[PDB]
């Protein structure tokens, strides 16, 4: 095309016109509703002002890709985006902030030919997006005149600046700046100022040799372009120079015995020791470091926070709590007591390593002034070669887990002799090397003030983080403002040796120490009353201060003050020596005794006093209930124990950790000997913590250097017994794909592995589901693979006896031998804990198993034929994709699983619509989906974190790095206004559990039982339509239409639909008096003022006839004789006038019938009784397929035909002087009209067959709690109009609330209240708008009317709605099995 015909401008309801790619060389050869036109990619050369002038509600406007030369002036519109790119555009108006301020978004004008811009061009506060990318700007306006705070993106890339200075306030609201293509040469400092800013672009601009250093205050910058950039200041994570824009902490340890202090007063001074150090856990002081002779290319002066940690044989274990990463270890032990000392130092190298990774380690000799001169050289040469032989492998390699120690790392000290005290101080100096600042060395005074102040006062020597922060504020020249960098502050300042981070803080170590000394000397005492439990109170009085909420917290993190039942402490140092009461005596059964027996090399000091009581904690929680461990919920009996190992008897079962000697081909060291009998559940809860105190207590997994890891597990073998012992590295692995093994000693006798290592095989699971391989069938290619789940975890699509399932079983193919025997037991010790946790749930909307296998080793789930809730919901993606009624029943199922597992202490962890399975979409059916529980906790995860996801998750419903990360400080994503969404209730959830206040979001029992009320789905929204005169509606489906107000001129009518919650007309001018009355049915619209006369419209009237007085209310009814919909109705004075409804008739013939005439003559009622008063006739209706009509007449319903026009009946249903409401005519049953009726202060309903004319029923409708109360059928309470819904019957009341009743016996069935919208008004008028929605007006005192919609729900929904919630609460609590 190559012009727009001239008729799509008197088009002025016309709102899309897409145009594009013609070859529109002129636009034109009304429109004032137009939003969106695009004439882009066209032959347009000039835009007249004519033709856009009449666009006053324009929205979108695309010009651009067009041979434009002079742009049009703006006019008054709220345009929202304008596209003027690629043109050849040489000026523009200065006026696009006089309307378009507020208004104007996005402007695209790239790839054109402005040499300037005008200055009112960055007035928009508005403005969104911005382009200027191919232009010849060489200047730009100044910055004090710019208001645009809102812009988000500029674009200055092939530009002429700096052939510059920008307002500040972009900082946060401006993130990509681009500056590409450009000539200039140095950075303005108004750069460095954009906080907000992520994107930066500078490249080809060949004036650019150095950056200024203040543009590394932005934290949110993360891209630099250096492409095609001279620059010099770069070296050849860009930031981390422009972000930052010698202190080291060293510590000494050994045997308790040998110097360990002399060495100190050596390097911190010359000549010998002067000074007694007697016994002291730990001294701190700044050893001062200069640099010796051949120092080069090193700091003049490095400051050393001198530290030994050292200890009277006693704090083991815990004196490893002081080693902090990036560190300088050196370990000090004798060169005089022979090898021995080597084999005692490789406690010392492990545990070193285990805990303080990548820290330089530095081995000395000292007193060996002992060794004689004539073999010295030869004598440490063999010394320092086994040194060497523990970190270095035979083969020459560093061995697994152990410090980089090479030749040159041993040295020797002679503190009395003073030889080679200078050899030390050139290393200690040479190795430091091969390794923000000056805040952080501003926060180094404020704590080192922080400990001298509590020094005085001997004030607890700790800070937690609350004391922290404000304490870094409160510093002079606090720069503090990133929260990593606070963060990093406190990492950083661990390494000083000022903080321990202890993943609370610690400042000053010395207190610390000497605080764990005085609780570990408790050993003299009242004697505890034996069995190691201190009282609460009886710990007082053994530096604290009412602070017993944090003092007493890091003591169970030290596993020495572990809490107990009925108030009471442990303390793991005064355990009980050995109570014996005849142990083992009888405890041998021999009937599934199973034994297993560890090595552990060496046993240490503080390996029985933290494993012993952290056996209790774990014990005495489970009894107590009546990923975290799950399994041994057995009974708990007499739990005999002594310093060494336990005694506890579940189900008859003698579990004994005992401790003995163990003889292997080196028939010496301690050992385990674990045995578990009792008839046959084996479970072995000591071996799941024994393997997990390591973690604790590292340097228990000795490798020993020379491929000998003497962390060992042995098993005895039932029939050799009748010691060989069975090693663990080859009965997991030979019990991971066969049953039956060979006994080295009996070849021919497989011994049965469920009796060598029951618990590898958990015959703790009841007989019943054992899924076995014969009859599942399965493949392992990938197209049957569900996902993963992280370490291992696969799963498969399988058979069972032809039910489809998915298995998961665990493919983990990861000397190396131990290295997949730890692999294989981890996979053990994890799948018994995942699967005794999903077989204890039999929730409904759980995946519950259906069986375990060994051989192969799997299990499988439950498996949803229709997908994931995200797959299903990926084709659907208008508002509610899966249903107005299908919505609630799932946003049921996931709180109510969500309710299951919070109250069986489980914590989801990643709430993803992923995660969620759906099996079924059917609305009759009961259950739809269930989850897939991951993890546990006891009572990121803080039990309400899924709820903060539980919104995530449901905010699809509705519809990783910088993905994800605007939910830390708290930022709602876009979600639409409660008015369109029309499912406003939940909503609420929407606000609800999207706040950073954890306490706020509600249980997950309380958003279930506020799925109890049915007003939580049939509510719609909540509509304002300002101040009106009355409510009006009409049939059909155009809703209601009206909502008059104003009067003469004023009267206006705001037309409000319901569907879309939009005005489409609001308060538009129509002549006229004040109006009572209005029907609108097909295009006929019959509108009555109160001036006793009739207007019509063909939706100014078309035509006006008079009426003896003011009518009340019309209803066509379906005579269904020449397609007529006689509009017979009442007036004030009583009477009734038919009128013809073909629009080519007069209109005129009134025809009307004299209603207390015919009740003289026909029911020879006399003019002196109450019901001949003129009575206003307030409602029609239709009965008898529309053969016979009723309408109200006071307390009587007088009855009209079609046929003869003449009342036939009367009938009473009430008493003298009552007013009937409304009348309506359901038949929806079958047959059996069942038109009911009301009263204005009776508030009374009435049930009549129309057939038999009988007042079947009389339901009083005054009850204050008519939820589910019943009735028999053969201020804020009063009845305000009945209304029918489908096949259910609703009573609104004025307080706001409306009564469904269900129809032989009649029983109300629900109260849809809405206790949210009383301040909104008193309900007035209500009616129904259409099949599928029910709308009422809350008007208050001012005169405003408030709109609330409910879904229009039948018998038939509220049943299936009832039956749902009570049937998935039956499907659980029901089930006692
Ligand atoms: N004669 C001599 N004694 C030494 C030497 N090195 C250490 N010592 C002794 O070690 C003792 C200090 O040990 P101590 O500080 O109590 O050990 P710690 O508790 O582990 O720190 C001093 O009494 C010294 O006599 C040495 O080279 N020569």
Redesign the pocket.
Same mark, same amino acid.
Do not use: F, M, W, Y
């Given at each position: 095309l190559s012009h727009l015909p001239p008729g799509f401008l008197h088009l002025s309801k016309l709102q899309k016109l897409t145009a594009s790619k013609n070859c529109l060389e002129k636009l034109f050869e009304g429109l004032r509703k137009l939003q969106e036109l695009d004439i882009s990619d066209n032959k347009l050369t000039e835009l007249p002002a004519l033709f856009l002038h009449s666009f006053k509600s324009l929205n979108s406007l695309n010009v651009s890709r067009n041979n434009l030369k002079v742009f049009p002036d703006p006019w008054a519109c709220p345009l929202k985006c304008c596209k003027a790119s690629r043109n050849a555009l040489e000026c523009l108006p200065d006026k696009m902030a006089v309307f378009w301020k507020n208004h104007l978004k996005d402007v695209d004008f790239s790839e054109n030919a402005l040499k300037e811009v005008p200055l009112g061009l960055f007035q928009l506060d508005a403005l969104m997006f911005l382009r200027l990318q191919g232009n010849q700007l060489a200047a730009l306006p100044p910055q004090e005149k710019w208001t645009c705070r809102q812009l988000k993106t500029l674009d200055l890339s092939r530009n002429q600046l700096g052939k510059l200075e920008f307002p500040a306030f972009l900082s946060e609201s401006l993130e990509v700046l681009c500056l590409n293509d450009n000539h200039l040469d140095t950075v303005p400092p108004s750069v460095c100022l954009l906080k907000s800013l992520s994107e930066l672009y500078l490249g080809n601009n060949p004036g650019l040799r150095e950056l200024p250093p203040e543009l590394g205050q932005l934290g949110n910058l993360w891209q630099l372009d250096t492409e095609d950039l001279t620059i010099s200041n770069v070296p050849a994570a860009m930031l981390s120079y422009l972000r930052a824009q010698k202190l080291m902490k060293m510590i000494i340890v $050994? @045997? @308790?015995?040998? $110097? %360990? !202090? /002399? &060495?100190l007063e050596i390097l911190q001074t010359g000549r010998a @020791?002067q000074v007694? *150090? $007697?016994?002291?856990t730990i001294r701190t002081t700044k050893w001062e470091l200069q640099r010796p002779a051949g120092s080069r290319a090193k700091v003049e002066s490095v400051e050393f926070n001198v530290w =030994?940690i050292? $200890?009277?044989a006693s704090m083991a274990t815990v004196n490893q709590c002081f080693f902090t990463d990036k560190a300088l270890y050196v370990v000090?032990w004798?060169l005089a007591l022979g090898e021995e000392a080597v084999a005692n130092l490789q406690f010392w190298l492990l545990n070193i390593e285990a805990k303080a990774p990548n820290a330089v380690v530095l081995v000395v000799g /000292? *007193? &060996? =002034? &002992?060794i004689e001169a004539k073999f010295r050289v030869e004598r440490i040469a063999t010394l320092r070669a086994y040194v060497l032989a523990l970190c270095r492998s035979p083969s020459g390699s560093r061995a697994t887990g152990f410090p980089d120690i090479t030749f040159k790392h041993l040295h020797e000290? !002679?503190? %009395? !002799?003073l030889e080679g005290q200078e050899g030390l101080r050139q290393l200690i100096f040479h190795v430091t090397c091969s390794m923000i600042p000056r805040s952080y060395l501003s926060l180094q005074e404020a704590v080192l003030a922080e400990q001298q102040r509590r020094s005085r006062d001997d004030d607890v020597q700790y800070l937690t983080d609350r004391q922290l922060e404000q304490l870094v504020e409160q510093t002079p020249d606090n720069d503090i403002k990133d929260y990593e960098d606070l963060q990093s502050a406190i990492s950083f300042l661990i390494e000083t040796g000022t903080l321990l981070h202890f993943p609370l803080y610690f400042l000053d170590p010395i207190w610390l120490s000497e605080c764990l000394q005085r609780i570990f000397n408790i050993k003299g005492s009242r004697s505890v009353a034996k069995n190691g439990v201190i009282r609460a109170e009886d710990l007082r009085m053994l530096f604290t201060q009412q602070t017993e909420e944090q003092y007493f917290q890091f003591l169970a993190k030290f596993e020495i003050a572990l809490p107990v039942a009925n108030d009471s402490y442990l303390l793991p140092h005064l355990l009980p020596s050995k109570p014996g009461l005849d142990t083992h005596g009888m405890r041998h059964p021999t009937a599934n005794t199973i034994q297993r027996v560890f090595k552990m090399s060496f046993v240490p000091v503080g390996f029985w006093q933290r494993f012993i009581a952290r056996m209790l904690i774990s014990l005495a929680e489970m009894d107590l209930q009546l990923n975290r461990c799950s399994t041994f919920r057995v009974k708990r009996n007499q739990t005999i124990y002594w310093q060494e190992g336990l005694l506890v008897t579940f189900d008859g079962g003698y579990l004994s950790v005992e401790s003995s000697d163990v003889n292997w081909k080196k028939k010496k060291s301690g050992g385990m000997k674990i045995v578990c009998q009792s008839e046959s559940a084996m479970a072995f809860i000591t071996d799941h913590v024994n393997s997990l105190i390591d973690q604790w207590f590292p340097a228990l997994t000795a490798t020993e250097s020379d491929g000998t890891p003497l962390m060992e597990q042995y098993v005895p073998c039932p029939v050799c017994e009748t010691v060989q012992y069975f090693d663990m590295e080859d009965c997991v692995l030979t019990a991971i794909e066969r049953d039956f093994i060979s006994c080295p000693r009996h070849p021919d006798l497989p011994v049965p592995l469920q009796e060598l290592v029951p618990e590898l095989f958990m015959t703790d699971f009841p007989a019943r589901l054992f899924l076995e391989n014969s009859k599942l069938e399965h493949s392992e290619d990938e197209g049957s693979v569900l996902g993963q789940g992280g370490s291992g975890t696969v799963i498969y699509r399988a058979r069972y006896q032809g039910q489809p399932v998915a298995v998961k079983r665990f493919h983990i193919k990861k000397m190396l031998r131990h290295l997949r025997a730890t692999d294989a037991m981890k996979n053990f010790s994890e799948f018994r804990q995942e699967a005794s946790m999903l077989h204890a749930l039999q929730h409904p909307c759980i995946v519950a198993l259906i069986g375990i296998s060994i051989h192969p080793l799997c299990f499988a789930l439950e498996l949803a034929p229709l997908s994931s809730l995200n797959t299903v919901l990926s084709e659907n993606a208008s508002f509610i994709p899966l249903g107005h009624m299908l919505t609630q029943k799932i946003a049921y199922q996931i709180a109510s699983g969500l309710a299951y597992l919070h109250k069986k202490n489980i914590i989801f962890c990643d709430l993803k619509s992923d995660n969620i399975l759906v099996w079924s979409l059917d609305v009759k059916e009961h259950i739809n989906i269930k989850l897939s529980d991951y993890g546990i906790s006891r009572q990121v995860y803080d039990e309400k974190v899924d709820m903060f996801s539980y919104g995530m998750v449901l905010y699809e419903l509705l519809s990783q790095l910088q993905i994800a990360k605007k939910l830390s400080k708290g930022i709602r994503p876009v979600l639409g206004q409660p008015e369109e969404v029309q499912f406003r209730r939940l909503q609420a959830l929407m606000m609800e559990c999207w706040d950073t206040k954890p306490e706020k979001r509600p249980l997950a029992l309380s958003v279930v039982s506020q799925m109890k009320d049915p007003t939580f789905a049939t509510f719609m929204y909540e509509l304002c339509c300002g101040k009106q005169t009355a409510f009006f509606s009409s049939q059909g489906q155009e809703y209601t239409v009206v909502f008059w107000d104003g009067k003469e001129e004023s009267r206006n009518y705001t037309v409000v639909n319901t569907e879309k919650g939009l005005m489409e007309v609001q308060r538009m001018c129509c002549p006229g008096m004040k109006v009572s009355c209005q029907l609108q049915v097909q295009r006929s619209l019959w509108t009555a003022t109160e001036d006793q006369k009739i207007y019509i419209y063909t939706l100014t009237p078309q035509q006006a006839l008079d009426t003896p007085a003011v009518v009340t209310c019309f209803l066509a009814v379906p005579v269904i004789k020449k397609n007529s919909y006689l509009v017979l109705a009442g007036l004030a004075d009583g009477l009734v006038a038919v009128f013809p409804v073909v629009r080519g008739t007069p209109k005129d013939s009134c025809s009307y019938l004299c209603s207390h005439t015919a009740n003289r003559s026909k029911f020879s009622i006399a003019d002196e009784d109450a019901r001949q008063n003129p009575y206003p006739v307030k409602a029609m209706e239709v009965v008898n397929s529309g053969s016979e009509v009723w309408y109200s007449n006071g307390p009587g319903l007088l009855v009209i035909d079609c046929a003869s026009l003449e009342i036939c009946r009367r009938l009473e249903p009430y008493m003298a002087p009552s007013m009937v409401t409304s009348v309506v005519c359901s038949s929806e049953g079958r047959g059996e009209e069942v038109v009911w009726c009301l009263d204005d202060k009776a508030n009374s309903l009435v049930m009549y067959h129309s057939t038999t004319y009988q007042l079947c029923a009389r339901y009083f409708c005054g009850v204050p709690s008519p939820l589910r109360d019943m009735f028999p059928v053969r201020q804020h309470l009063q009845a305000v109009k009945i209304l029918a819904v489908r096949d259910l019957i609703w009573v609104p009341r004025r307080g706001g609330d409306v009564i469904v009743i269900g129809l032989q016996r009649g029983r109300v069935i629900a109260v849809l209240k809405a206790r949210e919208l009383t301040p909104h008004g008193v309900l007035v008028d209500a009616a129904v708008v259409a099949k599928d929605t029910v709308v009422c007006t809350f008007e208050n005192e001012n005169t405003e009317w408030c709109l609330a919609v409910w879904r229009g729900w039948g018998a038939r929904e509220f049943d299936i709605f009832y039956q749902s919630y009570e049937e998935l609460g039956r499907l659980e609590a029901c089930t006692r099995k």
């Open positions: $050994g @045997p @308790p015995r040998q $110097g %360990k !202090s /002399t &060495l @020791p007694v *150090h $007697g016994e002291a =030994d050292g $200890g009277p000090v004798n /000292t *007193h &060996l =002034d &002992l000290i !002679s503190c %009395k !002799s």
